[PDB]
Amino acid sequence: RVLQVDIVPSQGEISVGESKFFLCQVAGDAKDKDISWFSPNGEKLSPNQQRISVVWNDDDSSTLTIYNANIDDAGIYKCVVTAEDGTQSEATVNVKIFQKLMFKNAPTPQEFKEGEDAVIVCDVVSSLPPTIIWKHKGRDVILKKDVRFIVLSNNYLQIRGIKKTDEGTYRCEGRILARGEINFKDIQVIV
Amino acid sequence: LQVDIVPSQGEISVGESKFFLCQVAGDAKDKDISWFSPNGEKLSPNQQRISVVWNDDDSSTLTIYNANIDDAGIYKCVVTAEDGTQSEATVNVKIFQKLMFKNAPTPQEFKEGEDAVIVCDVVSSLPPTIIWKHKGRDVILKKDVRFIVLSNNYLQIRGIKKTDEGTYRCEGRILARGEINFKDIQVIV
């Protein structure tokens, strides 16, 4: 039997905060061997830790479990098996981390300096580029036809010289065109 | 006439939202665009949970917010043109429940000598396999007939002893997808 190693699933994509495991399966002799996992940085992973878990199942398999995934867990992980005579073989598995459209920081209420230049904060995270739309009472602010309203490149909404009749509920809406994903956060703007 | 829906098919996670754009190869032509739910109901423009929004002469958008299992099914976009003839497109909407725990009370207390039932309610669109652990070790390794995993995944410990106290893990896995989730439950005797 020519020493061989495989990982199942052969690849994976874990959503932020969720968990997945990968089995390193060996096909070699019928003896004892060493199966070691290495993280993307090329460093060996210690077994039995609670979040980035490496558990020994039997002589021919070790399981890697990435619990409560975060974007920094992304990368090519490697499993290397060393038979008793020193012979080695390895397999790699590319792990991607996916961040669905979410609002990292969209405070409410958001109070403002009357007559001052307001900037409504809306920090969005998403692996896929989102298209942002700001609404007031469910209507795209761009339709107000007011030069004072400008959507900034960081998705924040600027309202120059804000007035009281500008107060109300502003929704920061994110969509992923052609894929159908949408999420929003309603923000109470107070003047 | 031609009718198209994008995304062509969609899977919405329970509690999340997804939108579907119905587009007609529009032109200088009058025509009506309407959305119908899986049960055949005509969905009218609204800004409610099952939203329908008129975009322009050639398109209307259906948005399903805070999706629940009863929203599953084939939705239909029909385009009736000038006389009363029609064309359609359909989109199959799946509601996806990821491997999660509806209930996993902690701690859970039982009286020594009593038959204890440790509560763990797991939900998942895809049927998972359950493993119960005590101190991080699979309970079957005890080879103790007092430990029985019930049909609903609850862990029963007959005549629970003080020595059975500790951290139990109700772990669910979906091998086919390499998915896993768990909840630790403190058992007090």
From Swiss-Prot, chain B:
Entry keyword set: Cell adhesion, Cell membrane, Disulfide bond, Glycoprotein, Heparin-binding, Immunoglobulin domain, Membrane, Phosphoprotein, Repeat, Signal, Transmembrane, Transmembrane helix
Molecular function via GO: cytoskeletal protein binding; fibroblast growth factor receptor binding; heparin binding; LRR domain binding; phosphatase binding
Record-listed heparin binding positions: K133, H134, K135, G136, R137, K142, K143, D144, V145, R146
Modification(s) after translation: Polysialylated by ST8SIA2 and ST8SIA4. Polysialylation modulates cell interactions by confering both attractive and repulsive properties that are highly regulated by ST8SIA2 and ST8SIA4. Polysialylation is formed on a-2,3-linked sialic acid of core glycans.
Main subcellular localisation: membrane
GO biological process: animal organ regeneration; axonal fasciculation; behavioral response to ethanol; calcium-independent cell-cell adhesion via plasma membrane cell-adhesion molecules; calcium-mediated signaling; cell adhesion; cell surface receptor signaling pathway; cellular response to ethanol
Localization terms from the record: Cell membrane
One GO term describing the cellular component: plasma membrane
Domain Ig-like C2-type positions: 1-92, 97-186
Disulfide bonds: C22-C77, C120-C170
Keyword Transmembrane: yes
Function noted in UniProt: This protein is a cell adhesion molecule involved in neuron-neuron adhesion, neurite fasciculation, outgrowth of neurites, etc.
Known partners and oligomeric status: Interacts with MDK. Found in a complex with SLC39A6, SLC39A10 and with NCAM1; this complex controls NCAM1 phosphorylation and integration into focal adhesion complexes during epithelial-tomesenchymal transition. Interacts with synaptic plasticity regulator PANTS.
Record's protein name: Neural cell adhesion molecule 1
Gene name of the record: Ncam1
Entire protein: shown range: 20 to 208 of 858
